[PDB]
Amino acid sequence: DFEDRVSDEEKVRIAAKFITHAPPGEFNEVFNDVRLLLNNDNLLREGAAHAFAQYNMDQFTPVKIEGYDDQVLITEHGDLGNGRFLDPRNKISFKFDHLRKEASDPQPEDTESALKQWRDACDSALRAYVKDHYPNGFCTVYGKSIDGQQTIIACIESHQFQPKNFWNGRWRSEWKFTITPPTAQVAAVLKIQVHYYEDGNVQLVSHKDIQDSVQVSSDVQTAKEFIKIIENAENEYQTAISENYQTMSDTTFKALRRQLPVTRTKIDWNKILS
Amino acid sequence: GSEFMSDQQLDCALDLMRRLPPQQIEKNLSDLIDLVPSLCEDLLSSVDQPLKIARDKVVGKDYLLCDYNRDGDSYRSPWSNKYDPPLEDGAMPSARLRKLEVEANNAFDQYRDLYFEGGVSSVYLWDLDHGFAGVILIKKAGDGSKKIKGCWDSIHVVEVQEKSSGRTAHYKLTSTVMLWLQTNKTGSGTMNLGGSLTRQMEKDETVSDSSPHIANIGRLVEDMENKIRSTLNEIYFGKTKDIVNGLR
């Protein structure tokens, strides 16, 4: 049954693809669709387990850990590979149920004192930046030795879910730099996704890649300069989005269909038919 | 086929296509049918896709492709009434309905010119027991000289239940407009705003020399498109932008 195995394998690959492309705030609905369409719960819960985790890490799903005030983001940088994720702010790991989006079983996690003060300073600066620039944003900052370099990875998430009004949106941004005095390269990606689906399906998908440089000196000064780069680039991106919206409304849209013919009257269908 | 009265998979498929990115409808629809091949005909008919343009090489005119003028892998031209590639037994309208289809195509080509001043249109009709149904297709792309690109697809399905003894008919119009805007500028990076809205109207009318089917249908399509255009402007450039700025 080689041909049948290829078909179940392809069906699960399709199901996983659909699940990972669910809009923000609509995972459950897409999952239910895919489950009923695949009609094989075993193929699904094993063959698509990776899709649940991939979606959550791709979306920077924020999660609340009981006993700690600030939420942590589920990201690829916190994946311990064993079902647990890292909270680099509270120096703990926690089990994460990707389907129920539940954090449990906090346990101390040992981290490297090398990157610790650089990470903490960037986190403190980033949290203050997010509190001021987002209505209800969350952020998580990691510090790792990666392919041979001390690296800081800052992640920001912000969503608004209003399914009763048939729309959901999410902002994600990710920022990386290596602690390489005197000057380090900054790489980042900014992402927006908005879904409106009252009597239709309209989606904004946007992303911007960033390359910049930051002066690396002390932990606290570098952290200040890093957030400055973040603020400048996120503000520029958001302003560019609005300016493009304006051009789309007042130019692009009008080159498609007119409001009325050049006659400035509705159509005389008797004249069209004679 | 609509073979099942209770079909939870069909409902889930349509729900799913309201949620996956409309930028990937074509690939998603094909993968979706792989999952539920027995819904192939239902999904091809019910999931709207961006319209493709073909060239009728007999008359030298473009026409629009959709499921409604397809048979196998061949598509029927509204201008020549022939399938490309050739098909010896393709679905064809009746001789009487083809005459109406020709007039409708001429009429909506004028509608296209007046409201869109460009683009391409096509009308395809097919017979029903006590009436007929049709699709009116319009595709218009914006200026390719511009960094911000746009494209408009109209998909109007009309179902006409005729009551000739009363010289009236009942019209049901289901209209989708797919609106696509895209740019890769320095400031915003990549920005893709795309998708569709669908609305429906029904109305009874007299059918006569002074108000024939094409005039009854034209007025409905005109009213619907004028309304949808205004809703699209509000939803795309008002609502989705306000959502963005509510995120940050």
């Binding site: - | 086929g1 409902d11 094909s30 049918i33 019910s46 048979d71 399905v157 989708t176 429906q200």
Partner: peptide, 25 residues
Amino acid sequence: LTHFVRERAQGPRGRRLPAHLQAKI
């Protein structure tokens, strides 16, 4: 969600399917 397209008139019955989808039957 409700779907105007679910009951939207479908094209004629009994037409051949496209080849790329025939392979999925």
